[PDB]
Design a protein around this ligand. Structure first.
Ligand SMILES: CC(C)CC[C@@H](O)[C@](C)(O)[C@H]1CC[C@@]2(O)C3=CC(=O)[C@@H]4C[C@@H](O)[C@@H](O)C[C@]4(C)[C@H]3CC[C@]12C
Ligand SMILES: CCN1C(=O)C=CC1=O
Lengths: 195, 238
């Protein structure tokens, strides 16, 4: 509800994003330039997916962090004003209706992260193999966990285009402008990735 | 290992049929396009004219194909129009990919004239053409066949779009084409069909970006003192 708290929340979301990427299997073994490229490309989709999935318990709102849930009237002030409605409609509501669990969310976000179609990669084939592993694993998981619904794999995969569309409504890297220094994003990523 | 049901085979046959049926503009329309050099225009104006004027025919073909898909006539007119407006550019990207020539790294138009990177650049559309051709290349690398293209096009058409009234019905229709694609891919790709289904569904995700890249022209055109044909301008909310 307060500005400073929201800023703290979103900054924390950034830090958490990088931490999450860091501990995805085989990601930190890629050349660091490639990690920077992949994170730059998926930045918005990854954040949006994460907080969308956190927003399912809450009604008519987007959870941006510890004790900070945002409704439509404060959405603009939170930095999500432009994508709020589509996020609630195409993502949160959908994640709720089909009961998307955490393993599936993690799979999807992994798929987003491991995009071999990102320009400038050195290890593109390796990235593609990783993405493929994620596909196979996810299909396996949905086939075992929920066998009553056989169209669940595709239904999960169909949220990826929705995420891309919403992420594209953003002509900037989400929440990055509320970091404190004049530290450029690539430097922030390099620093937060290397040990 | 699950086989194609007879209903699914009928559906796929229909799709392949429609796709072949509405793939090319009539010879009359093309001949009309080639035979109107207005006033002594340069190569640039020629390329632009051909690209846009043929693109009109392409959109008309897309509509003809869409209105014949099983399920489409079950929707409200409002949702039909909404879908068409929202998906025409993406479907257009698939049609384009089907005419990519690897050897020349070019797109072969319906008039058998090859269009390269330089053709588009000269037309005033250089900012985007590399992305277009890259999509074509990726698509080619996946070795996508007729049924897969048809099914993908159907799936793109029946995708979730903003401002839908009966979005649930659209989703339900889309499920069927999804399952048909999954089964087809399972039974007709060798030796197995590892992840090629998900790999094909990523194409949708890329089509969102390409559709945006196609909406993102016409501001570029206006800046070059060039102009989209009004039909295309309306259809793509430009
Ligand atoms: C803004 C707009 C005009 C640009 C759109 C452009 O970037 C596109 C996507 O590059 C357009 C331009 C020309 C184009 O319309 C085509 C010409 C054909 O002859 C054929 C006609 C028809 O048989 C189609 O199945 C394929 C193809 C190749 C289409 C595909 C889409 C193309 C290639
Ligand atoms: C700056 C405008 N904007 C938003 O409101 C949400 C993402 C974005 O870029």
């Amino acid at each position: 509800n307060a500005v400073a708290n929201i800023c703290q929340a979103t900054n924390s979301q950034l830090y958490q994003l990088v931490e999450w990427a860091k501990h995805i299997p085989h990601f930190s073994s890629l050349p660091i330039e490639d990690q920077v490229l992949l994170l730059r490309a998926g930045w918005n989709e990854l954040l949006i997916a994460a907080f969308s999935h956190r927003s399912v318990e809450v009604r008519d709102g987007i959870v941006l962090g510890a004790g900070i849930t945002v409704h439509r009237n404060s959405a603009h002030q939170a930095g999500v004003g432009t994508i709020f409605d589509r996020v609630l409609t195409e993502l949160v509501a959908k994640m709720r209706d089909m009961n998307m669990d955490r393993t599936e969310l993690g799979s999807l976000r992994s798929i987003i992260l491991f995009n071999p179609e990102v320009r400038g990669l050195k290890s593109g084939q390796e990235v593609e193999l990783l993405r493929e592993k994620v596909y196979a694993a996810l299909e396996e998981y949905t086939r075992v966990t929920r066998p009553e619904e056989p169209g669940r794999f595709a239904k999960l995969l169909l949220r990826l285009p929705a995420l891309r569309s919403i992420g594209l409504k953003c002509l900037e890297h989400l929440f990055f402008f509320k970091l404190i220094g004049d530290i450029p994003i690539d430097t922030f990523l390099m620093d937060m990735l290397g040990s | 290992v699950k086989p194609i049901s007879p209903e699914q085979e009928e559906l796929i046959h229909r799709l392949v049929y429609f796709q072949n049926e509405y793939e090319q503009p009539s010879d009359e329309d093309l001949k009309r396009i080639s035979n109107t050099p207005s006033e002594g225009e340069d190569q640039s104006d020629l390329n632009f004219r051909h690209i846009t004027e043929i693109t009109i025919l392409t959109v008309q073909l897309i509509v003809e194909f869409a209105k014949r898909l099983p399920g489409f006539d079950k929707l409200l007119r409002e949702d039909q129009i909404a879908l068409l407006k929202a998906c025409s550019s993406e479907v257009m990207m698939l049609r384009m990919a089907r005419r990519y020539d690897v050897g020349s790294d070019s797109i072969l138009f319906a008039n058998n004239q090859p269009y390269t990177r330089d053709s588009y650049s000269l037309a005033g559309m250089g900012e985007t053409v590399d992305d277009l051709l890259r999509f074509c290349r990726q698509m080619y690398g996946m070795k996508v066949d007729n049924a897969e293209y048809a099914l993908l096009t159907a799936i793109v058409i029946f995708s979730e779009r903003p401002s839908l009234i009966e979005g649930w019905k659209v989703e339900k229709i889309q499920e069927i084409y999804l399952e048909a694609l999954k089964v087809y891919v399972d039974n007709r790709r060798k030796p197995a069909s590892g992840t090629i289904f998900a790999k094909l569904l990523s194409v949708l995700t890329e089509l969102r970006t390409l559709g945006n890249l196609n909406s993102e022209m016409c501001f570029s055109l206006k800046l070059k003192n060039k102009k989209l044909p009004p039909f295309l301008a309306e259809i793509w909310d430009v």
